[PDB]
Scaffold this active site. Sequence first.
Site, mmCIF file in Angstrom:
data_model
loop_
_atom_site.group_PDB
_atom_site.id
_atom_site.type_symbol
_atom_site.label_atom_id
_atom_site.label_comp_id
_atom_site.label_asym_id
_atom_site.label_seq_id
_atom_site.Cartn_x
_atom_site.Cartn_y
_atom_site.Cartn_z
ATOM 1 N N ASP A 262 0.858 -1.180 0.000
ATOM 2 C CA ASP A 262 0.000 0.000 0.000
ATOM 3 C C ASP A 262 0.896 1.233 0.000
ATOM 4 O O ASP A 262 2.121 1.128 -0.081
ATOM 5 C CB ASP A 262 -0.972 -0.025 1.181
ATOM 6 N N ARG A 304 -11.024 -3.649 -4.690
ATOM 7 C CA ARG A 304 -11.658 -2.355 -4.419
ATOM 8 C C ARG A 304 -10.689 -1.199 -4.632
ATOM 9 O O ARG A 304 -10.722 -0.198 -3.911
ATOM 10 C CB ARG A 304 -12.257 -2.311 -3.009
ATOM 11 N N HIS A 307 -11.988 0.734 -9.028
ATOM 12 C CA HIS A 307 -13.197 1.531 -9.214
ATOM 13 C C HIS A 307 -12.974 2.999 -8.897
ATOM 14 O O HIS A 307 -13.860 3.811 -9.179
ATOM 15 C CB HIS A 307 -14.367 0.973 -8.373
#
Length: 396
Positions: A262, A304, A307
């Site tokens: 991340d 996720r 999007h």
Amino acid sequence: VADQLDSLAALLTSRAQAVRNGAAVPPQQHVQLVKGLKDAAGLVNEAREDLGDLMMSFVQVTALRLLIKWKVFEAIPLEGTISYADVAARVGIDVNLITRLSWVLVATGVLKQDGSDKIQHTARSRPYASRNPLSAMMIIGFDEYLPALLAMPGYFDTYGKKEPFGEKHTVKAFSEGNPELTVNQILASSPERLGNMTLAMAAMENMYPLSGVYDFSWVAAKAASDSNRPLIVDVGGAKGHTLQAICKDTPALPIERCVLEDLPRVIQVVKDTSDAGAQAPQLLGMDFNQEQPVKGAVVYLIRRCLHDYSDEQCVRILGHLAAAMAADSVLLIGETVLTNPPSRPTAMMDILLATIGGKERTIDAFGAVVGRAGLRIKGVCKQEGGDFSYIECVKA
Ligand SMILES: C[C@@H]1C=C[C@@H]2CCCC[C@H]2[C@@H]1C(=O)c1c(O)c(-c2ccc(O)cc2)c[nH]c1=O
Ligand SMILES: C[S@@+](CC[C@H](N)C(=O)[O-])C[C@H]1O[C@@H](n2cnc3c(N)ncnc32)[C@H](O)[C@@H]1O
């Protein structure tokens, strides 16, 4: 549309005396009854009643927002009744204003009035008497998303009538008065607003477990057949709860052989909020718009994330993963897959995502983006009872 009213009238008889009996009824017989009532309301209603129903929804949410903000729901005991006067004295607010806003919720059935002057909670209003993911979602919907939706007519006059994409000049930032700020910078403007969004998003934390839907023992085989190889890379995986949930399931595949990726600031918070000897995957701060650092893993997961971005940016992201992948690697995209036409909740979310520069996609739209990144769709596992799916892709 004659038989539509009868399937619902026969479904409202099943649910009717299951109430008189007190016996619970199947989880997905409540959801079909919920869908039927909406659709029937659609059929019987004409445009005039549509506008009245819509306007009533806006007043209802406004009353909800204010009575939450003013601690009125807190002041109403979870059981029994209290007078409007006593509520108003408790929260220090004009009893006339408390009464008028409460009457909105009485009329829609969120609150219940007893006699001429007493109010009480229902099941529908009790969640708003405390801080929790539901009341946070109420607040966020009203404070964040509603102004952006209201601002859309002016937004598309200002920026052109095209799908909005990009980190700056979002509908949200435009509606806030500062189109040059990103949504992150804006929600960081007050750690209380950040805190509500975090709590609200906890409602979708458990979402749809990858563990139960996908087999992963073939990864264990690769984990056994190659015990030196990166197993599962969670690209933009936030806290790594997806990754951990998987690895207890997979005997020959351990959390320590996986990689949580991340942004560096996100990874640093993972480090600072973990207990000393807790079992953990590898932690890698990175930018998934740039070269993927872990090469040849068995599985890359991107859940996720896509999007939030335009097709072109998604192609960039996926191309980096395709380049890092080996021939036997698999990429799992975790996203809603819109039907054509889409369901009510996914069409709703599609437009909410537009306010922040994103969109939901059909399988055809995913196929176009996946192919442009040099991948091909091998299969799709769709959750039961919804459209959130894992799209299994391999190098083309
Ligand atoms: C929790 C939020 C606060 C209140 C809103 C009221 C109810 C509708 C949406 C709610 C919001 C919400 O749920 C959101 C999402 O689900 C998603 C989301 C979109 C696509 C996914 O594959 C998974 C999650 C994105 N961004 C959201 O904000
Ligand atoms: C919607 S959250 C999804 C978290 C997790 N995959 C899940 O399913 O709950 C999107 C994640 O992508 C991360 N992210 C956003 N931009 C990124 C970037 N450029 N590089 C790496 N991660 C990024 C965010 O920090 C966030 O954790």
